[PDB]
Amino acid sequence: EYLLLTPGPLSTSEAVREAMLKDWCTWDDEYNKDIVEVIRTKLVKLATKHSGYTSVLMQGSGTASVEATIGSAIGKEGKLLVVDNGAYGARIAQIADYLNIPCHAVSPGETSQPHLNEVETALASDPAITHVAIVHCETTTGMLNPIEAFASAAKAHGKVVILDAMSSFGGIPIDIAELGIDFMISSANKCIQGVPGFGFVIAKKTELEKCQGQARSLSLDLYDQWHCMEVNHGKWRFTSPTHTVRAFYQALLELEQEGGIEARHNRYQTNQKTLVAGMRSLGFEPLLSDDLHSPIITSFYSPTHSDYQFKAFYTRLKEQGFVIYPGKVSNADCFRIGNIGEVYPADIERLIGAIEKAMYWQ
Template sequence: MDPSLLPDNPYLLLTPGPLSTTKGVKAAMLRDWCTWDDDYNGLVQDIRRRLVALSGEQTAGYTAVLMQGSGTFSVESVIGTVVPADGKLAVLTNGAYGNRIAQIARVLQIDGEVIDFGEVAQVQAEPLERLLQSDPAITHVVVVHCETTTGMLNPIAEVGKVAKAYGKTFIVDAMSSFGGVEIDMAALQIDFLISSTNKCIQGVPGFGFILAKEDELQKCKGRARSLSLDLYDQWATMEQYNGKWRYTSPTHVVRAFYQALLELEEEGGVEKRSQRYRENQRTLARGMEQIGFQPLLPREYQSPIITSFYYPDSRAFTFGEFYNRLKREGFVIYPGKISAAETFRVGNIGDIHPADMIRLVQAIERNIFW
């Protein structure tokens, strides 16, 4: 089917994923695939190669693993497979997604320590260094790169430098940043990086992926605390059987993700996409401030992925009514997720452009009711 013949969406998804996708990505899902077919498995292998190529300048020794489910499934596959029974995990958190990693560790009965920086402060390396000095039993360090609870971008370079100085395995949840913010795994000394199809690469939900140092992944055989989320076994099967997944794969999602990778390349790669997202965010923030909305984060902490705004100081304002008015105008936004303040969030990623942000601000100005 010609992608141009597909109907337009009734609204733009201004969320951190799922997000608005191109007609080309949608059209890619109109064909059925067999999971045993060589053509399909060759597609999987090409996706894996392309993901590794996006991981930085020096890609030798890195590999990619695809894992069914939402992004959290991939996070749990890493935490549950990579940390050995006698290991100990340090979790740096400043929002809901760092807290979720800590929860995963507790459910899996993995020993650990949590350094909580609150919801509106960046993660810092100094408390981690103090913890590693006082607790040599810690073997692994994990941090969220872009904490979409607020839109905070955390300084993973500084955290990784400390983690590796003390010989720890360094894990980065780059769920909402990979593909939209330039990341060089080798330069940042990242051992395991986790992301998902329905974020900055602009695919649809259905699987996540892990980029890993192959020698670190090799150490994980037999460690997994789950059958279906065994990261090592998933990787070994894909390696041995040329892209075959252990269990039924989301074939249509895989094909759509391949198309999304091609479109990322056509746009000019991560550098050009990052420029578009940053311009989206700047356009949104300027416009919102001009009509009286205050951003939650200072500019130096703000990611290009999602922006949080305080509710207006008005008894008449309710998020539900605000949401519904904007939806009727063709925009879907996100509720807030912090406990310290009443906020809402606007995603800056997906098939979204600065002109869309201008239209959104105009729609918000028409629908202000305070």
């Protein structure tokens, strides 16, 4: 009915939703081997060309998979270093606080890319740090963080690297082995284009094996979940959201049929650049400078006009068949427009015309 221009849950294809029409037995080999183990194999190949990697699927929101990683990888005597330049980086610090894990937040500001100066200074002054965490795309602003330079500084200091690639994996090309990522966390419902219900972790097999007996949660026990899936060939310890897992298997086939991540990245990149160009022609201004823009979601400043109201602008756009998203920027009045899911160049063009008609304050 509406095109969801959100960061996810988003507009999924008909086949992705149609795949949810069958019921599955959680104990049957058709589910565990022919569905789950296929997902697991495909996910590892999508994340790297290299050996030594493995995948774990975890029920719940994507945050639950981020908490599974933090609470399972970090030992009793470990300390976390986080790059917090948005709500998601802050959420990694909040997880650490709940789990009583010593944490050092390196806050570079929401509208600027992390100065690796602060990072290298934290890594040199604080030898107690065992793990470092960074958000690939800060979905709050749509900022693309420099994960390569960051993970390299961490590997140089002999620290474990955790990447929150929730809004980037499947839509931005990355080889986690080459970049030196130890744990890469991502979603079923963002760039891969499945539906929500679970998340996953693609990890270096040697680093995942170290998580055994270190977990702070039974449900979020990364090793125990991984080990059950390994020895029982796809078996989830507790009930898996079967329908959403089948929808994800379909979303993977549609990613292969598009031409993979490189092809999806190009479609996203074109959508985002056409969107920014069209929005600028209508007088809107992006929150970040173009060099910091990700091809996933763009933050735009709310019009300074006294008659402007997000809810009113949002409602007028919904009437035209487009669902935009509110801004999450702490020290800025903003709104966001995602360009992921069933969003194609023709849609972005139809949207720019719809933005124009929804500009009631003109």
